[PDB]
A paper describes a structure:
Here, we reveal the extended and contracted atomic structures of an intact contractile-tailed phage (φCD508) that binds to and penetrates the protective S-layer of the Gram-positive human pathogen Clostridioides difficile. The virion can be divided into five distinct regions: the head, neck, tail, baseplate, and needle. Structures of purified φCD508 virions in both extended and contracted conformations were determined by single-particle EM of frozen-hydrated samples; the resolution ranged from 2.6 to 4.0 Å for the extended phage, and 2.9 to 4.2 Å for the contracted form.
At the base of the capsid sits a unique opening, centered on what would be a fivefold symmetry axis in a complete icosahedron; it is made up of 12 copies of portal protein gp45, forming an opening through which DNA is ejected from the capsid. Thus, there is a 5–12-fold symmetry mismatch between the capsid and the portal. (J) CryoEM density of C1 portal/capsid assembly showing the symmetry mismatch between the pentamer capsid vertex and the dodecameric portal. DNA density shown in yellow does not form interactions with any portal proteins.
Numbering used by the authors:
A (entry chain K), B (entry chain L), C (entry chain A): 19 to 382, 389 to 469
């Protein structure tokens, strides 16, 4: 709606968070208030995170490219889990750490960069620069309950302040060997934590889960489903109604129920087999008390709520094709809608991935530290069609020779793109296959 | 839902575990509280585990590649079983052991690496490093009840601590010949156990079964089915109602029931056939007491619960095409949904497979220990189309010769991928055929 | 479905068995409690065992390959029956024995390896190594009732211990000429028995039948069908109702039933031809007492149970296309589902087949004893398409000659694959046709 120019309050940033425990419960269908309704959460989040894939780090420096290739080779699955965590929870925090420990399971890697997840509950507070809004300190806090290599239980409340100039850590409880209390300097002068913020908003400090828009619809769907289930349980089975001359005599004679009041008080049950025949007198009557529909219009309301859920999440209908088998007729026809959604969604994380690649390069000189994020194919391209258009361009070239030698400039780029498309396996997330194939080719020659 | 920045509890890792016995019972349709509902568990789990196949270990060192080829040749089926176990139970544990025993059944393989399964119930406790969160000890425990080669029954409670520096085993009860009590050194400085964690989450210590999201839906489906079945058994067959002048005399004359009270008390049955004729008085009446529908709306509710189950598991609709025969048509059209699900699912295990391959290589010097995991094709490629695009690329090359000799770098990689696509049989799990074809070629030359 | 870390009992191996007699009765539709329900057992097991075919033993040693070719030539049908038995019963035991007896029916084969089945009931107990869980003794027991070549009946209770170091046999009854009583040495120091274990689980000593998951559904289907059939038999035929002024006089005049009580006591029947005309007085009435539906909703419940059975067994819908004729229209479209199921199923037996081939090779020096298990085509390939892509390979090669002489390496492997896929007849189980074609080529030259 509209409003006058005045009569509007001062802008204030929101520090509210996503209630990550509830989001995880909805994702796993565990919350009792959403069990019948939260069935839609998993397909939405998982289809969205599967179709967007993982970033493909691209940089023009050969050494930086090699470092990023090694990093993705190590942590492509962790990147995909970062995507699905950000979608489910709204916030996901990635901590890059460098460990020089020597252990015999990794004799080939003296120094390793670790892709550590900080659970969003651990981040008690983020201290932002009031002007530039970038973080200047992360207040992590966790309750570590663990067991010693002996038989002793252990507990410790660890809070650690992570800042660009140093990191402080103090534990309130049992000793932890790997963490040294007190302040220790931070080797690089930046915070090595990356905040992944799904559905980031300029008026919000933290991200938003993809479940948040649909959550009231899930609640309504659960309520309608539960009401329908209870109504059917109570009334779907018709009730036999016997209008008897003497109810007590009939019960005593036919079921041995001598005291029906006590029989009802104790919840007694009359056993029936189905193949019964009724011998009544003239005045008595037997009839079934039956409902035309114990559910009423709950089916239509659930269909409307399903439509609203699909609209809000913007899920293409083939994801929910069991509801609407028409969508399964042509997935390729609907795939542009998925491409549009994934295009919109990938931009919410590419800046974070550029920051992560920049920090990885710094934490391990290079002519450039900027990275461009490539991506997996949402709608896979036909390699045969690519070769067809390649040969068509080639035969178009080498004719009307006044055009100059930019034919080489065009064809080298086309060949590079063709190799990228061909070597990247459609059904395998990331581009580890292409990197390892290049490495094997370099080794074998 | 949202919440304020404050008023949030401290993060704590969850040590809860999947009820493995219940998970197996649901998988095998054995639990009486889920028999009519747990019919969906098997298609979900088995379609997911069969479409993802088994990993293809790739490494640039030829010795490491040969070792991994031998390992997959020996233990490819156990890896598919590991996938199935991780999906069904949430947790699967693989113990790699090296055995030098000489037995006549293996005259050649003097030394063997054994792919042993630790049942998830055996793992009494996992001791984690409080900082790095990696396991530093595994507390295994099992009750071994067995028969001696004579006639004697044997029972022994064995618990063994498996640590990176040594392994300790103590057995209470009868002697076990193959296990030596007390501590013995660990020849390898790392724990040789691999923890396969399905649906791993940063806030969880153990994996989640694929049955957990659908379990309440399975329970509701079972309840609705059982209620419908009981209602139909009670009321589907219509009941003949006779309004007689005198019931007792009618029963005595027509069925010889001289004492109807005792007849009902003992549960006597009146034998009848379909062909009958009723001779009644003018005042008497005979009628059938019948239900329009003994089930009511349970069919619609079961349809809704089936939709919820299919949505939660994200199973493509052709898996349950008997419910929806439209889904059976155009399975290739629905394959991208399966491809997406398998893409997302394979990343929960690839890191564990990298660890397993690394440990196998260390257990059996190599220039590298990093293994890249390939995979079976979900939507198999057409060999003829690969040949066509190979020809198109080839004729595109050898023209506009200013491009240089990088055409070798593209065509050799394409030929490698091409031979990989051919030698790997689509219908056969893993790549045993591709490895042994090369081995037979090397032998025969 | 979750549980806390503690409050879990110790792991114990389960030695329950599959009730093989009941499984065979269900397979043969012989159990009276499953006759109307067990109709689905045969198509499930037989489709699964027929589409998976038999193993193709591949080894790189020419002599070992020849030995395995002879073995499969002898025992391909027994191998397929082993698959069927493992699926039906859960357990199948194969005993490889070597006999040097001279008989005139086999003058060409002085020494033969016999593929003997041990019925799973014969195996009283399997003694396992408590640590490695490999069997160390098989306790076989059978009641041999037979006839002498004369007129005498014979009965003997034979139990034999089969161990790696020796085999013991004792007979409690009549003499058996072929079994020398007492202990005898084992020529090879391994047990010559192979245990085929369908649906093997780490927590189960024995295998599981494919009937076990569906058995409660079969029981429910039988119960619903039997209730429906009895209800229809009782009530489908409408009952003629005559409201008469005097029933006894009517019966006496129209049917000669002078004493209706004695007529009803003896179960007398009134003969009717269908073409009757009723002459009544004004006060009397005649009407048919008829049911709208004697079955009620049993049809819908049976459809639901059929869907559950198809889901549990994971049978592709074209196997039960009589229920759903839509499936039959697109069998080729559904073949990927069958391929997935069969690919998953084959891995449960391939280790046993590798062990069997290894034992066969040992029981008859070789450079290698490891065998790779090939398989029949589930979705058969088109030979013309294979030749087409071969031509595409050939024209792609011999161009851009810097690639080297690995064209030979690729093309020889593809020619071998083409010969394999061409000579192996699709409609004939196994590869005996290709083996004898090669043998005839060698003989005739």
């Amino acid at each position: 709606m509209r409003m006058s120019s005045g009569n509007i309050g001062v802008y204030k940033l929101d520090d509210s968070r996503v209630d990550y425990e509830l989001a995880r419960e909805l994702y796993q269908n565990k919350n009792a208030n959403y069990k019948l309704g939260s069935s839609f959460v998993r397909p939405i989040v998982n289809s969205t995170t599967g179709f967007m894939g993982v970033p493909h780090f691209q940089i023009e420096d050969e050494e930086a490219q090699y470092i990023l290739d090694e990093f993705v080779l190590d942590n492509t699955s962790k990147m995909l889990k970062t995507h699905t965590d950000s979608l489910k929870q709204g916030d996901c925090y990635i901590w890059i750490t460098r460990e020089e420990r020597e252990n015999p399971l990794y004799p080939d890697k003296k120094v390793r960069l670790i892709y550590n997840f900080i659970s969003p509950e651990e981040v008690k507070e983020i201290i932002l620069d009031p002007t530039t809004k970038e973080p200047i300190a992360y207040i992590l806090e966790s309750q570590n309950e663990w067991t010693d290599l002996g038989e002793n239980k252990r507990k410790a409340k660890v809070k650690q302040i992570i800042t660009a100039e140093s990191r402080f850590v103090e534990v309130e409880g049992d000793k932890i060997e790997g963490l040294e209390e007190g302040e220790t300097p931070n080797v690089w002068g930046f915070i090595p934590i990356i905040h992944f913020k799904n559905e980031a908003d300029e008026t919000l400090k933290y991200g938003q889960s993809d479940i948040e828009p649909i959550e009231p619809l899930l609640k309504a769907y659960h309520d309608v489903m539960l009401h329908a289930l209870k109504g059917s349980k109570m009334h779907s089975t018709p009730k036999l109604k016997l209008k008897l001359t003497d109810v007590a005599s009939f019960l005593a004679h036919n079921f041995g129920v001598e005291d029906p009041v006590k029989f009802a008080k104790e919840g007694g049950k009359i056993n029936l087999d189905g193949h019964e025949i009724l011998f009544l007198n003239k005045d008595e009557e037997a009839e079934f008390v039956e409902v035309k529909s114990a559910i009423g219009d709950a089916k239509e309301l659930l269909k409307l709520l399903f439509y609203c859920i699909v609209d809000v999440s913007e899920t293409p209908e083939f994801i929910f094709g069991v509801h609407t088998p028409s969508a399964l007729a042509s997935v390729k026809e609907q795939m542009p809608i998925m491409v549009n959604k994934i295009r919109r969604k990938r931009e919410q994380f590419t800046n974070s991935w550029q920051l992560l690649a920049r920090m990885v390069l710094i934490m391990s000189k290079y002519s450039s530290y900027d990275v461009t994020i490539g991506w997996d194919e949402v709608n896979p391209r036909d390699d045969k069609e690519l070769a067809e258009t390649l040969e068509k361009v080639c035969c178009a070239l080498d004719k009307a020779l006044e055009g100059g030698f930019i034919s080489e400039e065009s064809t080298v780029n086309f060949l590079a793109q063709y190799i990228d498309t061909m070597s990247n396996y459609i059904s395998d997330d990331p581009e580890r296959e292409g990197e390892r194939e290049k490495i094997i080719k370099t080794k074998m020659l």
